[model samples]
Target: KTRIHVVQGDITKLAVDVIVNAAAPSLMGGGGVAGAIHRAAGPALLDACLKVRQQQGDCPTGHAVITLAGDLPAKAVVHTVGPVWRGGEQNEDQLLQDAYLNSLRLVAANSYTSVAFPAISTGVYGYPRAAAAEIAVKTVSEFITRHALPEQVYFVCYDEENAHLYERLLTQQ
Candidate 1:
């Protein structure tokens, strides 16, 4: 039931209903892809993140919160904090898996037929690229199989290496 596409492109370029940001707990638009999303989305993104934190405390790892897209092309953004890779210990795998799972859950809850995602935790969080890709595709596939989620899921990898990895894994699936 999964119809996920892997591509090497700017996630902001996708005209989907939602874009999942690989965010930090603070949601302060740190470096890596998160920073790029923040920059593209303008200052309103920061304000929405601040309001979310003010109301709900820090966005814990393995959870996601919704925010307006601000200046980005998407309708909304799902900010999910991913765990810092720790050599496969500390339940990093499950946390990373949750990052994708929760985002997709939000998509369904919000009734978005199409959504896009960046490679969570594979940037400065230092997740091993291949392992992260495996977890992402597997988690998304299982979620789509188990629930009526988004009809179109896009893995928008900004870098060629990760794009190819996701492309390979998606094809294999």
Candidate 2:
């Protein structure tokens, strides 16, 4: 069994096995969650992502890549790209599901027992927060209950609204 946590705070401070990044496909640093992670994790994280970009060009949306956490407390970082919302016809839900799914897959493969995630795509990606929250909780909870890995999962929200939304949804589950 796994325990899910809801917190309104910085994901960069979590002392977990892995912290999922709501990253751009390029893995190049940007504002919001990705920017803070890169800054806290220092330049080494950028170097790693640059190498990844060199080899793969870019991580596709819904897919993820892993790298050392550098200065962050977590052991590793799972960088996954959430889809840009497009009127719900462009497989946005599935892409968002993949973002969380693939990240959990990495955690399981690496024997990670604890992981944290932000409210992906709800930021600059323009995903509606309440709708995104429903998908996020539902997808993650299903994954946790069905998979034996990731003994613990955390949803870290930067703002009170998201935090409460996630908390309420989690409570419903």
Candidate 3:
């Protein structure tokens, strides 16, 4: 019955069916969570991204693409591009929601039983942590309620601050 979890730890280390990467448009690798995932997944991850890039070009904000997790313990990785916080006036809320929704949609389509996610756009993208957390929890909760494939989901936070935020938000649900 407890489908959602909040844990403070590394995302790459999680042993779920899939791990969501807060990716950039290029998906070539950048700082924050994306950089760490690319590093942990080894060179094969880059090759997979390159293949996706060659075929589809850059991933737009709020869109998602799937690839092999490579060296990671998970079966696959869902690379989703979240919107940058530009004063919250540029439909940031909808785009952020789409990021979470699209990632979950991939998980369900693949019938992955479990997945983990980072606080998308909360790092250099400048999304307010609290607002982002709210959107994340709300979107995932709604998705899980409508679907049954991904039996479990984890909010793998990099620090206690984020973990606490997600925990508190989850309590409200």
Candidate 4:
């Protein structure tokens, strides 16, 4: 089994191979986990993101791109765009699943040994916590079953409620 950890803390502090950023489509930086990552990783991160934007414009929802980690502990950052919830009518769940799925694929493609993820789309993006947690756990678990390189996966929760939710979901898994 791929070791899945549910922890309530700062994702920027994790000494993993990769840190998955719940990034804005712009990939430059915004509030919540994205802002925390950019601030912790320093200006080098912004410079890299600017270069990415210059190359590809905005990252579409359900897709991901990679960049250097700058000052953070991880070797790299996988920036994934999560879908904005629109009453579940706009394929939000699938996009959210794709966010995690694509991030893991990128990690595996790079042969990263570990990665951490935030609760994508559950913040100001307005995804429901319970539903999003289900998708996160199910998708990550299924992906880990098939890949061996990312031998460890972490669900880094920003608060107690999310931590407990992820813990429960992981335990049930």
Computed on alpha carbons, the lDDT of every model, listed in order, comes to: 0.89, 0.92, 0.94, 0.92
- What's the lDDT for residue 146 in model 2? 93
Model 3: how far is 66 from its true place, Å?
Answer: 0.3
Residue-level lDDT tens digits of model 2 in 1-173: 23889988999999999999999989999998999999999999999999999999989999998999899999999999999999899999999989999999999999999999999998999999998989889988998889889989999999897898888888786
Expressed as tens digits, the lDDT of each residue in 97-156 for candidate 4 is 999999999999998999999999999899999999999999999888887868999999
RMSD of candidate 3 to the true fold?
Answer: 0.8
- Which residue ranges in model 1 land beyond 4 Å of their true spot? none
Highest-lDDT candidate = 3
My TM-score estimates for the predictions, one after another, are 0.96, 0.97, 0.98, 0.97
Clashes of each: 0, 0, 0, 0
Give the TM-score (vs. native) of candidate 2.
Answer: 0.97
Off by over 4 Å in 2: none
RMSD (Cα, Å) of model 1: 1.3
* Model 4 poorest 10 in a row by lDDT: 1-10
Whole-structure CA lDDT of model 3: 0.94
Residue 22 CA displacement from its true place in model 3, Å: 0.6
Q: Distance (Å) between predicted and true CA of 105, model 1?
A: 0.7
